[PDB]
Scaffold this active site. Structure first.
Site, PDB file in Angstrom:
ATOM      1  N   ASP A 148       0.805  -1.369  -0.089  1.00 23.58           N
ATOM      2  CA  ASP A 148       0.021   0.146   0.093  1.00 23.58           C
ATOM      3  C   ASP A 148       0.873   1.205  -0.110  1.00 23.58           C
ATOM      4  O   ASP A 148       0.253   2.544   0.200  1.00 23.58           O
ATOM      5  CB  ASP A 148      -0.858  -0.130   1.312  1.00 23.58           C
ATOM      6  CG  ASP A 148      -0.479   0.056   2.653  1.00 23.58           C
ATOM      7  OD1 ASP A 148       0.785   0.266   2.720  1.00 23.58           O
ATOM      8  OD2 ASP A 148      -1.171  -0.242   3.632  1.00 23.58           O
ATOM      9  N   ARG A 171       1.219   6.851   0.080  1.00 30.91           N
ATOM     10  CA  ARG A 171       0.432   5.886   0.799  1.00 30.91           C
ATOM     11  C   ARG A 171      -1.113   5.827   0.136  1.00 30.91           C
ATOM     12  O   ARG A 171      -1.589   6.909  -0.163  1.00 30.91           O
ATOM     13  CB  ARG A 171       0.157   6.480   2.194  1.00 30.91           C
ATOM     14  CG  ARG A 171      -0.487   5.417   3.085  1.00 30.91           C
ATOM     15  CD  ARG A 171      -0.275   3.879   3.170  1.00 30.91           C
ATOM     16  NE  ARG A 171      -0.648   3.288   4.254  1.00 30.91           N
ATOM     17  CZ  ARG A 171      -2.001   2.581   4.323  1.00 30.91           C
ATOM     18  NH1 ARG A 171      -2.784   2.789   3.106  1.00 30.91           N
ATOM     19  NH2 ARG A 171      -2.351   1.940   5.279  1.00 30.91           N
ATOM     20  N   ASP A 182      -5.389  -0.917   3.809  1.00 30.87           N
ATOM     21  CA  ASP A 182      -4.554  -1.216   4.853  1.00 30.87           C
ATOM     22  C   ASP A 182      -4.177  -2.898   3.995  1.00 30.87           C
ATOM     23  O   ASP A 182      -4.887  -3.829   4.305  1.00 30.87           O
ATOM     24  CB  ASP A 182      -4.710  -1.496   6.183  1.00 30.87           C
ATOM     25  CG  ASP A 182      -3.683  -1.558   7.126  1.00 30.87           C
ATOM     26  OD1 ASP A 182      -2.647  -0.991   6.542  1.00 30.87           O
ATOM     27  OD2 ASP A 182      -3.873  -2.340   7.992  1.00 30.87           O
ATOM     28  N   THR A 183      -2.651  -2.933   3.712  1.00 30.67           N
ATOM     29  CA  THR A 183      -2.254  -4.106   3.191  1.00 30.67           C
ATOM     30  C   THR A 183      -1.547  -4.686   4.569  1.00 30.67           C
ATOM     31  O   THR A 183      -1.016  -3.785   5.274  1.00 30.67           O
ATOM     32  CB  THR A 183      -1.205  -4.080   2.079  1.00 30.67           C
ATOM     33  OG1 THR A 183      -0.435  -2.931   2.230  1.00 30.67           O
ATOM     34  CG2 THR A 183      -2.070  -3.989   0.797  1.00 30.67           C
ATOM     35  N   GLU A 236       1.715  -5.852   6.710  1.00 36.53           N
ATOM     36  CA  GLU A 236       3.085  -5.709   6.371  1.00 36.53           C
ATOM     37  C   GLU A 236       3.852  -6.888   5.825  1.00 36.53           C
ATOM     38  O   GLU A 236       3.465  -7.865   5.579  1.00 36.53           O
ATOM     39  CB  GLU A 236       3.774  -5.624   7.825  1.00 36.53           C
ATOM     40  CG  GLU A 236       3.518  -4.261   8.474  1.00 36.53           C
ATOM     41  CD  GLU A 236       3.353  -2.959   7.937  1.00 36.53           C
ATOM     42  OE1 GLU A 236       2.166  -2.556   7.585  1.00 36.53           O
ATOM     43  OE2 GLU A 236       4.517  -2.687   7.072  1.00 36.53           O
ATOM     44  N   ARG A 292       3.925  11.673   3.579  1.00 36.88           N
ATOM     45  CA  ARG A 292       3.556  10.733   2.595  1.00 36.88           C
ATOM     46  C   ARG A 292       2.427  11.578   1.768  1.00 36.88           C
ATOM     47  O   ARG A 292       1.409  11.784   2.200  1.00 36.88           O
ATOM     48  CB  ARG A 292       3.367   9.387   2.937  1.00 36.88           C
ATOM     49  CG  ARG A 292       4.356   8.650   3.738  1.00 36.88           C
ATOM     50  CD  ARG A 292       4.150   7.186   4.320  1.00 36.88           C
ATOM     51  NE  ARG A 292       2.729   7.333   5.154  1.00 36.88           N
ATOM     52  CZ  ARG A 292       2.350   6.189   5.667  1.00 36.88           C
ATOM     53  NH1 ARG A 292       2.906   4.882   5.587  1.00 36.88           N
ATOM     54  NH2 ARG A 292       0.900   6.189   6.314  1.00 36.88           N
TER      55      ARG A 292
HETATM   56  C1  LIG Z   1      -4.038   5.617   4.944  1.00 36.32           C
HETATM   57  C2  LIG Z   1      -3.684   6.931   5.610  1.00 36.32           C
HETATM   58  C3  LIG Z   1      -2.946   6.744   6.747  1.00 36.32           C
HETATM   59  N1  LIG Z   1      -2.727   7.589   7.851  1.00 36.32           N
HETATM   60  C4  LIG Z   1      -1.807   7.372   9.005  1.00 36.32           C
HETATM   61  C5  LIG Z   1      -2.644   6.513  10.197  1.00 36.32           C
HETATM   62  C6  LIG Z   1      -1.497   5.947  10.778  1.00 36.32           C
HETATM   63  O1  LIG Z   1      -0.847   6.984  11.787  1.00 36.32           O
HETATM   64  P1  LIG Z   1      -0.391   6.390  13.376  1.00 36.32           P
HETATM   65  O2  LIG Z   1       1.008   6.203  12.789  1.00 36.32           O
HETATM   66  O3  LIG Z   1      -0.390   7.661  14.016  1.00 36.32           O
HETATM   67  O4  LIG Z   1      -1.051   5.252  13.697  1.00 36.32           O
HETATM   68  C7  LIG Z   1      -0.315   5.473   9.623  1.00 36.32           C
HETATM   69  C8  LIG Z   1      -0.839   4.089   9.189  1.00 36.32           C
HETATM   70  O5  LIG Z   1       0.024   4.045   7.941  1.00 36.32           O
HETATM   71  P2  LIG Z   1       0.585   2.582   7.652  1.00 36.32           P
HETATM   72  O6  LIG Z   1      -0.749   1.609   7.622  1.00 36.32           O
HETATM   73  O7  LIG Z   1       1.350   2.794   6.345  1.00 36.32           O
HETATM   74  O8  LIG Z   1       1.494   2.096   8.703  1.00 36.32           O
HETATM   75  O9  LIG Z   1      -0.622   6.632   8.848  1.00 36.32           O
HETATM   76  C9  LIG Z   1      -3.154   8.834   7.634  1.00 36.32           C
HETATM   77  O10 LIG Z   1      -2.998   9.831   8.431  1.00 36.32           O
HETATM   78  N2  LIG Z   1      -3.985   9.187   6.737  1.00 36.32           N
HETATM   79  C10 LIG Z   1      -4.331   7.992   5.409  1.00 36.32           C
HETATM   80  O11 LIG Z   1      -5.162   8.608   4.717  1.00 36.32           O
HETATM   81 CA   LIG Z   2      -0.132  -1.252   6.204  1.00 34.93          CA
END
Ligand SMILES: Cc1cn([C@H]2C[C@H](OP(=O)(O)O)[C@@H](COP(=O)(O)O)O2)c(=O)[nH]c1=O
Ligand SMILES: [Ca+2]
Length: 130
Positions: A16, A30, A35-36, A38, A76
């Protein structure tokens, strides 16, 4: 309304996230609404490989921002990614390689489309739902 934009691919990262050259910065994007697993969790290597090949093989790579925030707190990019007209975000969910996730109201245009895909993957008990 919602418009697509040519995407320049540096490299796929995992299920993802992908690295794009975006106005000619190297930038992690991203995928919105998904959510994929890890890379080292179950279906993680499969999700990575699916996204990788889907974006690598496409003649036409596109990025589509939603109506809200275009970057997250980690700097991102947040977007839908399309490969020859097919949405990567949707295809991952349809194949049971991603869950619908991280649905924020500023950025939720394709929510119902992805939930429909997720329901089909669920019904079929595919991958994550197996
Ligand atoms: C998909 C997405 C993730 N995020 C944030 C939420 C999660 O933050 P926290 O780290 O504070 O939990 C993290 C998850 O990404 P990953 O699934 O890439 O790890 O990225 C956003 O803020 N906006 C989004 O649209
Ligand atoms: Ca992920």
């Amino acid at each position: 309304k919602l418009h697509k934009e040519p995407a320049t691919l540096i490299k796929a990262i995992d299920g993802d996230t992908v690295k794009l050259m975006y106005k000619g910065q190297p930038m992690t994007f991203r995928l919105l609404l998904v959510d994929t697993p890890e890379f080292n969790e179950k279906y993680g290597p499969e999700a990575s490989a699916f996204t990788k090949k889907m974006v690598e093989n496409a003649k036409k790579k596109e990025v589509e921002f939603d109506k809200g925030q275009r970057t997250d707190k980690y700097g991102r990019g947040l977007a839908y990614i399309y490969a020859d007209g097919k949405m990567v975000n949707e295809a991952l969910v349809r194949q049971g390689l991603a869950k619908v996730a991280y649905v924020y109201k500023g950025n939720n245009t394709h929510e119902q489309l992805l939930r429909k895909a997720e329901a089909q993957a669920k019904k079929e008990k595919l991958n994550i739902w197996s």
